[PDB]
mmCIF file with all atom_site columns, C-alpha atoms and ligand atoms in Angstrom:
data_model
loop_
_atom_site.group_PDB
_atom_site.id
_atom_site.type_symbol
_atom_site.label_atom_id
_atom_site.label_alt_id
_atom_site.label_comp_id
_atom_site.label_asym_id
_atom_site.label_entity_id
_atom_site.label_seq_id
_atom_site.pdbx_PDB_ins_code
_atom_site.Cartn_x
_atom_site.Cartn_y
_atom_site.Cartn_z
_atom_site.occupancy
_atom_site.B_iso_or_equiv
_atom_site.pdbx_formal_charge
_atom_site.auth_seq_id
_atom_site.auth_comp_id
_atom_site.auth_asym_id
_atom_site.auth_atom_id
_atom_site.pdbx_PDB_model_num
ATOM   1   C CA  . UNK A 1 1   ? -21.217 3.026  -7.720  1.00 29.60 ? 30  UNK A CA  1
ATOM   2   C CA  . UNK A 1 2   ? -19.219 4.205  -4.948  1.00 31.20 ? 31  UNK A CA  1
ATOM   3   C CA  . UNK A 1 3   ? -18.153 0.449  -4.500  1.00 30.13 ? 32  UNK A CA  1
ATOM   4   C CA  . UNK A 1 4   ? -14.662 1.219  -2.229  1.00 28.56 ? 33  UNK A CA  1
ATOM   5   C CA  . UNK A 1 5   ? -12.856 -2.080 -0.870  1.00 28.09 ? 34  UNK A CA  1
ATOM   6   C CA  . UNK A 1 6   ? -9.987  -3.014 0.927   1.00 29.21 ? 35  UNK A CA  1
ATOM   7   C CA  . UNK A 1 7   ? -9.209  0.218  2.323   1.00 29.60 ? 36  UNK A CA  1
ATOM   8   C CA  . UNK A 1 8   ? -7.372  0.705  5.443   1.00 28.09 ? 37  UNK A CA  1
ATOM   9   C CA  . UNK A 1 9   ? -9.526  3.753  7.868   1.00 28.66 ? 38  UNK A CA  1
ATOM   10  C CA  . UNK A 1 10  ? -7.506  6.368  8.809   1.00 32.45 ? 39  UNK A CA  1
ATOM   11  C CA  . UNK A 1 11  ? -9.873  8.383  10.347  1.00 35.52 ? 40  UNK A CA  1
ATOM   12  C CA  . UNK A 1 12  ? -13.613 8.542  10.327  1.00 35.00 ? 41  UNK A CA  1
ATOM   13  C CA  . UNK A 1 13  ? -14.018 10.247 6.890   1.00 34.85 ? 42  UNK A CA  1
ATOM   14  C CA  . UNK A 1 14  ? -10.083 9.163  5.210   1.00 33.12 ? 43  UNK A CA  1
ATOM   15  C CA  . UNK A 1 15  ? -9.254  5.941  3.896   1.00 35.67 ? 44  UNK A CA  1
ATOM   16  C CA  . UNK A 1 16  ? -6.252  4.906  2.071   1.00 39.70 ? 45  UNK A CA  1
ATOM   17  C CA  . UNK A 1 17  ? -5.415  1.882  -0.294  1.00 37.98 ? 46  UNK A CA  1
ATOM   18  C CA  . UNK A 1 18  ? -1.794  0.521  -2.275  1.00 32.94 ? 47  UNK A CA  1
ATOM   19  C CA  . UNK A 1 19  ? -3.513  0.298  -5.658  1.00 29.59 ? 48  UNK A CA  1
ATOM   20  C CA  . UNK A 1 20  ? -3.686  1.962  -9.257  1.00 32.64 ? 49  UNK A CA  1
ATOM   21  C CA  . UNK A 1 21  ? -6.237  5.186  -8.997  1.00 35.41 ? 50  UNK A CA  1
ATOM   22  C CA  . UNK A 1 22  ? -7.054  3.818  -12.605 1.00 34.81 ? 51  UNK A CA  1
ATOM   23  C CA  . UNK A 1 23  ? -8.049  0.157  -11.655 1.00 33.78 ? 52  UNK A CA  1
ATOM   24  C CA  . UNK A 1 24  ? -9.747  1.462  -8.802  1.00 31.65 ? 53  UNK A CA  1
ATOM   25  C CA  . UNK A 1 25  ? -11.965 3.870  -10.979 1.00 33.72 ? 54  UNK A CA  1
ATOM   26  C CA  . UNK A 1 26  ? -12.697 0.632  -13.014 1.00 33.58 ? 55  UNK A CA  1
ATOM   27  C CA  . UNK A 1 27  ? -13.636 -1.516 -9.921  1.00 31.57 ? 56  UNK A CA  1
ATOM   28  C CA  . UNK A 1 28  ? -15.701 1.605  -8.146  1.00 31.71 ? 57  UNK A CA  1
ATOM   29  C CA  . UNK A 1 29  ? -17.498 3.115  -10.747 1.00 35.24 ? 58  UNK A CA  1
ATOM   30  C CA  . UNK A 1 30  ? -17.201 6.396  -8.483  1.00 31.78 ? 59  UNK A CA  1
ATOM   31  C CA  . UNK A 1 31  ? -18.918 9.543  -8.903  1.00 31.59 ? 60  UNK A CA  1
ATOM   32  C CA  . UNK A 1 32  ? -15.869 11.676 -8.896  1.00 27.55 ? 61  UNK A CA  1
ATOM   33  C CA  . UNK A 1 33  ? -12.080 10.863 -9.505  1.00 27.23 ? 62  UNK A CA  1
ATOM   34  C CA  . UNK A 1 34  ? -9.554  13.571 -8.844  1.00 28.39 ? 63  UNK A CA  1
ATOM   35  C CA  . UNK A 1 35  ? -6.849  13.891 -11.155 1.00 26.54 ? 64  UNK A CA  1
ATOM   36  C CA  . UNK A 1 36  ? -3.585  15.156 -10.339 1.00 29.08 ? 65  UNK A CA  1
ATOM   37  C CA  . UNK A 1 37  ? -3.424  18.246 -12.807 1.00 30.89 ? 66  UNK A CA  1
ATOM   38  C CA  . UNK A 1 38  ? -1.458  21.223 -13.879 1.00 32.89 ? 67  UNK A CA  1
ATOM   39  C CA  . UNK A 1 39  ? -2.738  24.529 -14.871 1.00 35.65 ? 68  UNK A CA  1
ATOM   40  C CA  . UNK A 1 40  ? -3.031  24.069 -18.662 1.00 33.59 ? 69  UNK A CA  1
ATOM   41  C CA  . UNK A 1 41  ? -4.536  20.353 -17.994 1.00 33.96 ? 70  UNK A CA  1
ATOM   42  C CA  . UNK A 1 42  ? -1.824  18.633 -19.862 1.00 33.28 ? 71  UNK A CA  1
ATOM   43  C CA  . UNK A 1 43  ? -2.144  14.995 -18.776 1.00 36.41 ? 72  UNK A CA  1
ATOM   44  C CA  . UNK A 1 44  ? 0.902   13.710 -18.984 1.00 40.25 ? 73  UNK A CA  1
ATOM   45  C CA  . UNK A 1 45  ? 3.022   11.927 -16.587 1.00 40.53 ? 74  UNK A CA  1
ATOM   46  C CA  . UNK A 1 46  ? 1.792   10.969 -13.116 1.00 42.47 ? 75  UNK A CA  1
ATOM   47  C CA  . UNK A 1 47  ? -1.783  10.404 -12.163 1.00 42.72 ? 76  UNK A CA  1
ATOM   48  C CA  . UNK A 1 48  ? -2.908  12.341 -15.401 1.00 43.88 ? 77  UNK A CA  1
ATOM   49  C CA  . UNK A 1 49  ? -1.428  10.458 -17.982 1.00 40.82 ? 78  UNK A CA  1
ATOM   50  C CA  . UNK A 1 50  ? -2.252  7.012  -16.558 1.00 42.86 ? 79  UNK A CA  1
ATOM   51  C CA  . UNK A 1 51  ? -5.808  8.776  -16.156 1.00 43.53 ? 80  UNK A CA  1
ATOM   52  C CA  . UNK A 1 52  ? -6.105  10.031 -19.619 1.00 41.92 ? 81  UNK A CA  1
ATOM   53  C CA  . UNK A 1 53  ? -4.916  6.726  -21.382 1.00 39.96 ? 82  UNK A CA  1
ATOM   54  C CA  . UNK A 1 54  ? -7.454  4.640  -19.732 1.00 41.03 ? 83  UNK A CA  1
ATOM   55  C CA  . UNK A 1 55  ? -10.129 6.925  -21.496 1.00 39.80 ? 84  UNK A CA  1
ATOM   56  C CA  . UNK A 1 56  ? -8.383  6.528  -24.582 1.00 39.88 ? 85  UNK A CA  1
ATOM   57  C CA  . UNK A 1 57  ? -7.325  10.473 -25.078 1.00 41.32 ? 86  UNK A CA  1
ATOM   58  C CA  . UNK A 1 58  ? -10.778 11.350 -24.765 1.00 43.11 ? 87  UNK A CA  1
ATOM   59  C CA  . UNK A 1 59  ? -10.166 13.650 -21.484 1.00 38.27 ? 88  UNK A CA  1
ATOM   60  C CA  . UNK A 1 60  ? -7.227  15.492 -23.220 1.00 39.81 ? 89  UNK A CA  1
ATOM   61  C CA  . UNK A 1 61  ? -9.614  16.250 -26.301 1.00 37.63 ? 90  UNK A CA  1
ATOM   62  C CA  . UNK A 1 62  ? -12.159 17.365 -23.252 1.00 42.70 ? 91  UNK A CA  1
ATOM   63  C CA  . UNK A 1 63  ? -9.419  19.553 -21.504 1.00 44.03 ? 92  UNK A CA  1
ATOM   64  C CA  . UNK A 1 64  ? -8.168  21.273 -24.836 1.00 43.22 ? 93  UNK A CA  1
ATOM   65  C CA  . UNK A 1 65  ? -11.520 22.852 -25.884 1.00 44.26 ? 94  UNK A CA  1
ATOM   66  C CA  . UNK A 1 66  ? -11.950 23.843 -22.171 1.00 44.38 ? 95  UNK A CA  1
ATOM   67  C CA  . UNK A 1 67  ? -8.265  25.605 -21.656 1.00 44.32 ? 96  UNK A CA  1
ATOM   68  C CA  . UNK A 1 68  ? -9.116  27.048 -25.058 1.00 45.22 ? 97  UNK A CA  1
ATOM   69  C CA  . UNK A 1 69  ? -11.852 29.208 -23.944 1.00 43.32 ? 98  UNK A CA  1
ATOM   70  C CA  . UNK A 1 70  ? -11.357 29.789 -20.171 1.00 43.74 ? 99  UNK A CA  1
ATOM   71  C CA  . UNK A 1 71  ? -7.489  29.449 -20.087 1.00 45.93 ? 100 UNK A CA  1
ATOM   72  C CA  . UNK A 1 72  ? -5.423  27.897 -17.347 1.00 45.21 ? 101 UNK A CA  1
ATOM   73  C CA  . UNK A 1 73  ? -6.461  26.958 -13.844 1.00 49.49 ? 102 UNK A CA  1
ATOM   74  C CA  . UNK A 1 74  ? -4.798  28.941 -10.518 1.00 46.43 ? 103 UNK A CA  1
ATOM   75  C CA  . UNK A 1 75  ? -2.651  26.517 -8.334  1.00 49.02 ? 104 UNK A CA  1
ATOM   76  C CA  . UNK A 1 76  ? -4.620  25.316 -5.408  1.00 45.89 ? 105 UNK A CA  1
ATOM   77  C CA  . UNK A 1 77  ? -7.979  25.580 -7.975  1.00 48.77 ? 106 UNK A CA  1
ATOM   78  C CA  . UNK A 1 78  ? -10.153 23.217 -9.155  1.00 48.35 ? 107 UNK A CA  1
ATOM   79  C CA  . UNK A 1 79  ? -12.158 22.303 -12.187 1.00 50.32 ? 108 UNK A CA  1
ATOM   80  C CA  . UNK A 1 80  ? -14.949 19.497 -12.551 1.00 48.42 ? 109 UNK A CA  1
ATOM   81  C CA  . UNK A 1 81  ? -15.244 18.001 -15.798 1.00 51.86 ? 110 UNK A CA  1
ATOM   82  C CA  . UNK A 1 82  ? -16.339 14.550 -17.520 1.00 50.50 ? 111 UNK A CA  1
ATOM   83  C CA  . UNK A 1 83  ? -15.602 11.368 -15.885 1.00 49.17 ? 112 UNK A CA  1
ATOM   84  C CA  . UNK A 1 84  ? -15.837 9.921  -19.036 1.00 50.05 ? 113 UNK A CA  1
ATOM   85  C CA  . UNK A 1 85  ? -15.556 5.738  -19.048 1.00 47.99 ? 114 UNK A CA  1
ATOM   86  C CA  . UNK A 1 86  ? -13.776 5.983  -15.442 1.00 48.69 ? 115 UNK A CA  1
ATOM   87  C CA  . UNK A 1 87  ? -16.333 8.103  -12.953 1.00 51.22 ? 116 UNK A CA  1
ATOM   88  C CA  . UNK A 1 88  ? -19.367 10.543 -13.487 1.00 50.28 ? 117 UNK A CA  1
ATOM   89  C CA  . UNK A 1 89  ? -16.820 13.593 -13.002 1.00 50.50 ? 118 UNK A CA  1
ATOM   90  C CA  . UNK A 1 90  ? -13.773 14.269 -12.847 1.00 53.24 ? 119 UNK A CA  1
ATOM   91  C CA  . UNK A 1 91  ? -12.354 16.828 -10.599 1.00 54.35 ? 120 UNK A CA  1
ATOM   92  C CA  . UNK A 1 92  ? -8.920  18.298 -11.711 1.00 57.24 ? 121 UNK A CA  1
ATOM   93  C CA  . UNK A 1 93  ? -7.187  19.459 -8.772  1.00 59.69 ? 122 UNK A CA  1
ATOM   94  C CA  . UNK A 1 94  ? -4.051  21.538 -9.137  1.00 59.90 ? 123 UNK A CA  1
ATOM   95  C CA  . UNK A 1 95  ? -1.623  20.747 -6.166  1.00 61.41 ? 124 UNK A CA  1
ATOM   96  C CA  . UNK A 1 96  ? 1.755   22.952 -5.674  1.00 60.30 ? 125 UNK A CA  1
ATOM   97  C CA  . UNK A 1 97  ? 4.605   21.749 -7.591  1.00 58.23 ? 126 UNK A CA  1
ATOM   98  C CA  . UNK A 1 98  ? 7.434   22.461 -4.831  1.00 58.81 ? 127 UNK A CA  1
ATOM   99  C CA  . UNK A 1 99  ? 10.464  21.151 -7.326  1.00 59.74 ? 128 UNK A CA  1
ATOM   100 C CA  . UNK A 1 100 ? 9.291   23.717 -9.453  1.00 58.35 ? 129 UNK A CA  1
ATOM   101 C CA  . UNK A 1 101 ? 9.107   26.611 -6.431  1.00 58.25 ? 130 UNK A CA  1
ATOM   102 C CA  . UNK A 1 102 ? 5.162   26.520 -6.360  1.00 57.46 ? 131 UNK A CA  1
ATOM   103 C CA  . UNK A 1 103 ? 4.065   27.091 -2.688  1.00 56.68 ? 132 UNK A CA  1
ATOM   104 C CA  . UNK A 1 104 ? 3.674   24.460 -0.101  1.00 58.24 ? 133 UNK A CA  1
ATOM   105 C CA  . UNK A 1 105 ? 1.064   26.596 1.734   1.00 56.65 ? 134 UNK A CA  1
ATOM   106 C CA  . UNK A 1 106 ? -1.606  26.183 -1.291  1.00 57.44 ? 135 UNK A CA  1
ATOM   107 C CA  . UNK A 1 107 ? -1.569  22.301 -0.795  1.00 58.69 ? 136 UNK A CA  1
ATOM   108 C CA  . UNK A 1 108 ? -4.614  23.335 1.833   1.00 56.52 ? 137 UNK A CA  1
ATOM   109 C CA  . UNK A 1 109 ? -6.695  24.886 -0.493  1.00 55.03 ? 138 UNK A CA  1
ATOM   110 C CA  . UNK A 1 110 ? -5.981  22.185 -3.134  1.00 56.99 ? 139 UNK A CA  1
ATOM   111 C CA  . UNK A 1 111 ? -7.653  19.392 -0.804  1.00 55.60 ? 140 UNK A CA  1
ATOM   112 C CA  . UNK A 1 112 ? -10.281 22.372 0.560   1.00 55.06 ? 141 UNK A CA  1
ATOM   113 C CA  . UNK A 1 113 ? -11.733 21.167 -3.094  1.00 52.63 ? 142 UNK A CA  1
ATOM   114 C CA  . UNK A 1 114 ? -13.080 18.102 -2.087  1.00 52.08 ? 143 UNK A CA  1
ATOM   115 C CA  . UNK A 1 115 ? -15.510 19.594 0.377   1.00 50.88 ? 144 UNK A CA  1
ATOM   116 C CA  . UNK A 1 116 ? -17.896 20.252 -2.079  1.00 50.28 ? 145 UNK A CA  1
ATOM   117 C CA  . UNK A 1 117 ? -18.165 16.484 -2.995  1.00 51.18 ? 146 UNK A CA  1
ATOM   118 C CA  . UNK A 1 118 ? -19.703 13.996 -0.634  1.00 52.62 ? 147 UNK A CA  1
ATOM   119 C CA  . UNK A 1 119 ? -17.325 10.877 -1.822  1.00 52.84 ? 148 UNK A CA  1
ATOM   120 C CA  . UNK A 1 120 ? -13.962 10.767 -4.218  1.00 56.59 ? 149 UNK A CA  1
ATOM   121 C CA  . UNK A 1 121 ? -11.510 8.543  -5.257  1.00 55.10 ? 150 UNK A CA  1
ATOM   122 C CA  . UNK A 1 122 ? -8.061  10.743 -4.931  1.00 54.23 ? 151 UNK A CA  1
ATOM   123 C CA  . UNK A 1 123 ? -4.633  10.720 -5.091  1.00 56.48 ? 152 UNK A CA  1
ATOM   124 C CA  . UNK A 1 124 ? -2.143  12.102 -2.494  1.00 55.36 ? 153 UNK A CA  1
ATOM   125 C CA  . UNK A 1 125 ? -2.110  15.391 -3.659  1.00 54.05 ? 154 UNK A CA  1
ATOM   126 C CA  . UNK A 1 126 ? 1.544   16.838 -5.101  1.00 54.35 ? 155 UNK A CA  1
ATOM   127 C CA  . UNK A 1 127 ? 3.580   13.815 -4.584  1.00 52.72 ? 156 UNK A CA  1
ATOM   128 C CA  . UNK A 1 128 ? 5.602   12.573 -6.805  1.00 52.21 ? 157 UNK A CA  1
ATOM   129 C CA  . UNK A 1 129 ? 7.483   14.345 -9.201  1.00 53.48 ? 158 UNK A CA  1
ATOM   130 C CA  . UNK A 1 130 ? 5.621   17.292 -7.635  1.00 52.91 ? 159 UNK A CA  1
ATOM   131 C CA  . UNK A 1 131 ? 7.802   17.028 -4.681  1.00 54.14 ? 160 UNK A CA  1
ATOM   132 C CA  . UNK A 1 132 ? 5.677   17.201 -1.365  1.00 53.52 ? 161 UNK A CA  1
ATOM   133 C CA  . UNK A 1 133 ? 6.655   15.338 1.597   1.00 53.20 ? 162 UNK A CA  1
ATOM   134 C CA  . UNK A 1 134 ? 4.417   12.717 1.237   1.00 51.69 ? 163 UNK A CA  1
ATOM   135 C CA  . UNK A 1 135 ? 3.354   12.577 4.936   1.00 53.64 ? 164 UNK A CA  1
ATOM   136 C CA  . UNK A 1 136 ? 2.917   16.029 4.797   1.00 51.61 ? 165 UNK A CA  1
ATOM   137 C CA  . UNK A 1 137 ? 0.002   15.872 1.993   1.00 49.66 ? 166 UNK A CA  1
ATOM   138 C CA  . UNK A 1 138 ? -1.653  13.162 4.134   1.00 49.77 ? 167 UNK A CA  1
ATOM   139 C CA  . UNK A 1 139 ? -1.475  15.199 7.163   1.00 51.66 ? 168 UNK A CA  1
ATOM   140 C CA  . UNK A 1 140 ? -3.089  18.182 5.060   1.00 50.83 ? 169 UNK A CA  1
ATOM   141 C CA  . UNK A 1 141 ? -5.767  15.787 3.369   1.00 53.87 ? 170 UNK A CA  1
ATOM   142 C CA  . UNK A 1 142 ? -6.748  14.744 6.767   1.00 50.60 ? 171 UNK A CA  1
ATOM   143 C CA  . UNK A 1 143 ? -6.985  18.137 8.443   1.00 50.71 ? 172 UNK A CA  1
ATOM   144 C CA  . UNK A 1 144 ? -8.883  19.567 5.697   1.00 50.18 ? 173 UNK A CA  1
ATOM   145 C CA  . UNK A 1 145 ? -10.934 17.334 4.089   1.00 51.30 ? 174 UNK A CA  1
ATOM   146 C CA  . UNK A 1 146 ? -14.525 16.842 5.800   1.00 52.27 ? 175 UNK A CA  1
ATOM   147 C CA  . UNK A 1 147 ? -16.183 14.518 2.977   1.00 54.87 ? 176 UNK A CA  1
ATOM   148 C CA  . UNK A 1 148 ? -15.500 11.063 2.454   1.00 54.26 ? 177 UNK A CA  1
ATOM   149 C CA  . UNK A 1 149 ? -12.183 10.497 0.565   1.00 50.23 ? 178 UNK A CA  1
ATOM   150 C CA  . UNK A 1 150 ? -10.193 7.420  -0.592  1.00 49.58 ? 179 UNK A CA  1
ATOM   151 C CA  . UNK A 1 151 ? -7.071  7.779  -1.437  1.00 50.84 ? 180 UNK A CA  1
ATOM   152 C CA  . UNK A 1 152 ? -5.309  5.386  -3.766  1.00 49.26 ? 181 UNK A CA  1
ATOM   153 C CA  . UNK A 1 153 ? -1.336  5.184  -3.544  1.00 48.35 ? 182 UNK A CA  1
ATOM   154 C CA  . UNK A 1 154 ? 0.467   3.200  -6.582  1.00 46.21 ? 183 UNK A CA  1
ATOM   155 C CA  . UNK A 1 155 ? 3.952   2.227  -4.698  1.00 44.88 ? 184 UNK A CA  1
ATOM   156 C CA  . UNK A 1 156 ? 3.720   -0.161 -1.583  1.00 45.71 ? 185 UNK A CA  1
ATOM   157 C CA  . UNK A 1 157 ? 6.564   1.369  -0.297  1.00 47.70 ? 186 UNK A CA  1
ATOM   158 C CA  . UNK A 1 158 ? 5.737   4.797  -0.132  1.00 49.36 ? 187 UNK A CA  1
ATOM   159 C CA  . UNK A 1 159 ? 2.192   3.444  1.207   1.00 50.14 ? 188 UNK A CA  1
ATOM   160 C CA  . UNK A 1 160 ? 4.034   1.580  3.845   1.00 48.45 ? 189 UNK A CA  1
ATOM   161 C CA  . UNK A 1 161 ? 5.707   4.404  5.145   1.00 47.60 ? 190 UNK A CA  1
ATOM   162 C CA  . UNK A 1 162 ? 2.905   6.376  5.274   1.00 51.01 ? 191 UNK A CA  1
ATOM   163 C CA  . UNK A 1 163 ? 0.744   4.137  6.938   1.00 49.91 ? 192 UNK A CA  1
ATOM   164 C CA  . UNK A 1 164 ? 3.346   3.564  9.294   1.00 52.76 ? 193 UNK A CA  1
ATOM   165 C CA  . UNK A 1 165 ? 4.027   7.433  10.040  1.00 53.17 ? 194 UNK A CA  1
ATOM   166 C CA  . UNK A 1 166 ? 0.252   8.328  10.407  1.00 54.56 ? 195 UNK A CA  1
ATOM   167 C CA  . UNK A 1 167 ? 0.156   5.432  13.231  1.00 55.38 ? 196 UNK A CA  1
ATOM   168 C CA  . UNK A 1 168 ? 2.851   6.781  15.103  1.00 57.56 ? 197 UNK A CA  1
HETATM 169 C C1  . LIG B 2 .   ? 2.847   9.845  -5.460  1.00 56.22 ? 210 LIG B C1  1
HETATM 170 C C2  . LIG B 2 .   ? 2.663   8.515  -6.682  1.00 56.22 ? 210 LIG B C2  1
HETATM 171 C C3  . LIG B 2 .   ? 2.496   7.142  -6.127  1.00 56.22 ? 210 LIG B C3  1
HETATM 172 C C4  . LIG B 2 .   ? 1.531   8.854  -6.930  1.00 56.22 ? 210 LIG B C4  1
HETATM 173 N N1  . LIG B 2 .   ? 1.059   8.399  -8.298  1.00 56.22 ? 210 LIG B N1  1
HETATM 174 C C5  . LIG B 2 .   ? 0.046   7.319  -8.749  1.00 56.22 ? 210 LIG B C5  1
HETATM 175 N N2  . LIG B 2 .   ? -1.276  7.188  -7.692  1.00 56.22 ? 210 LIG B N2  1
HETATM 176 C C6  . LIG B 2 .   ? -2.118  6.658  -7.996  1.00 56.22 ? 210 LIG B C6  1
HETATM 177 N N3  . LIG B 2 .   ? -2.645  5.860  -8.860  1.00 56.22 ? 210 LIG B N3  1
HETATM 178 C C7  . LIG B 2 .   ? -1.345  6.112  -9.949  1.00 56.22 ? 210 LIG B C7  1
HETATM 179 N N4  . LIG B 2 .   ? -1.468  5.547  -11.155 1.00 56.22 ? 210 LIG B N4  1
HETATM 180 C C8  . LIG B 2 .   ? -0.395  5.861  -11.832 1.00 56.22 ? 210 LIG B C8  1
HETATM 181 C C9  . LIG B 2 .   ? 0.025   5.029  -13.094 1.00 56.22 ? 210 LIG B C9  1
HETATM 182 C C10 . LIG B 2 .   ? 1.005   5.170  -13.706 1.00 56.22 ? 210 LIG B C10 1
HETATM 183 N N5  . LIG B 2 .   ? 0.882   4.689  -14.874 1.00 56.22 ? 210 LIG B N5  1
HETATM 184 N N6  . LIG B 2 .   ? 0.080   3.909  -14.847 1.00 56.22 ? 210 LIG B N6  1
HETATM 185 C C11 . LIG B 2 .   ? -0.177  2.396  -15.827 1.00 56.22 ? 210 LIG B C11 1
HETATM 186 C C12 . LIG B 2 .   ? 0.665   1.563  -15.552 1.00 56.22 ? 210 LIG B C12 1
HETATM 187 O O1  . LIG B 2 .   ? 1.435   1.538  -14.701 1.00 56.22 ? 210 LIG B O1  1
HETATM 188 N N7  . LIG B 2 .   ? 0.122   0.289  -16.440 1.00 56.22 ? 210 LIG B N7  1
HETATM 189 C C13 . LIG B 2 .   ? 1.254   -0.939 -16.188 1.00 56.22 ? 210 LIG B C13 1
HETATM 190 C C14 . LIG B 2 .   ? -0.847  0.066  -17.326 1.00 56.22 ? 210 LIG B C14 1
HETATM 191 C C15 . LIG B 2 .   ? -0.487  3.919  -13.690 1.00 56.22 ? 210 LIG B C15 1
HETATM 192 C C16 . LIG B 2 .   ? 0.382   6.376  -10.942 1.00 56.22 ? 210 LIG B C16 1
HETATM 193 C C17 . LIG B 2 .   ? -0.348  7.044  -9.911  1.00 56.22 ? 210 LIG B C17 1
HETATM 194 C C18 . LIG B 2 .   ? 1.167   10.230 -7.565  1.00 56.22 ? 210 LIG B C18 1
HETATM 195 C C19 . LIG B 2 .   ? 0.510   11.417 -6.702  1.00 56.22 ? 210 LIG B C19 1
HETATM 196 C C20 . LIG B 2 .   ? 0.308   12.729 -7.218  1.00 56.22 ? 210 LIG B C20 1
HETATM 197 C C21 . LIG B 2 .   ? 1.296   13.237 -8.140  1.00 56.22 ? 210 LIG B C21 1
HETATM 198 C C22 . LIG B 2 .   ? 1.624   12.173 -9.023  1.00 56.22 ? 210 LIG B C22 1
HETATM 199 C C23 . LIG B 2 .   ? 1.950   11.143 -8.908  1.00 56.22 ? 210 LIG B C23 1
HETATM 200 O O2  . LIG B 2 .   ? 2.595   12.624 -9.954  1.00 56.22 ? 210 LIG B O2  1
HETATM 201 C C24 . LIG B 2 .   ? 2.560   14.272 -10.397 1.00 56.22 ? 210 LIG B C24 1
HETATM 202 C C25 . LIG B 2 .   ? 1.392   14.859 -9.685  1.00 56.22 ? 210 LIG B C25 1
HETATM 203 O O3  . LIG B 2 .   ? 1.135   14.474 -8.401  1.00 56.22 ? 210 LIG B O3  1
#
């Protein structure tokens, strides 16, 4: 478990790799995989759709029963549920969707959830169709997370831009 390999070390606790988070979860067998969730835990699109399909929809069935009784999460909040075949636990984290006018300042609160876990496999929060500046998201991660975080970014041009920008 937690067999991470091939990552660039950005800081003493933040690592990054150009990889699909689903393929990393299958290789690594992490204690925790982070999902780039939304408040009603509808696992479509982006990371969430890929993670749920890799569980053959088990993640969606569990998430629907959670939401039915507990209601939606808040932006910046999180929820631990089963990791199914991908991890021991899945930490569902809601970053702000700035393309839908949500508050970018809540991105810090979204990464603060990672500090409850010693080591995590995670995506870059609020990137992709959520619209945040990826360079900004990586800075908020580095400044906020104190535990060991292994970021999987599934886009070579974005990965190459993030690393170049970070190394300036
Ligand atoms: C910024 C981008 C690159 C990032 N996406 C990702 N980051 C890391 N691992 C990822 N895997 C996939 C994926 C999708 N489909 N598949 C199956 C596949 O390709 N097969 C051929 C079987 C794998 C996407 C992905 C991101 C991060 C956060 C976000 C966000 C997006 O969407 C909205 C919410 O927040």
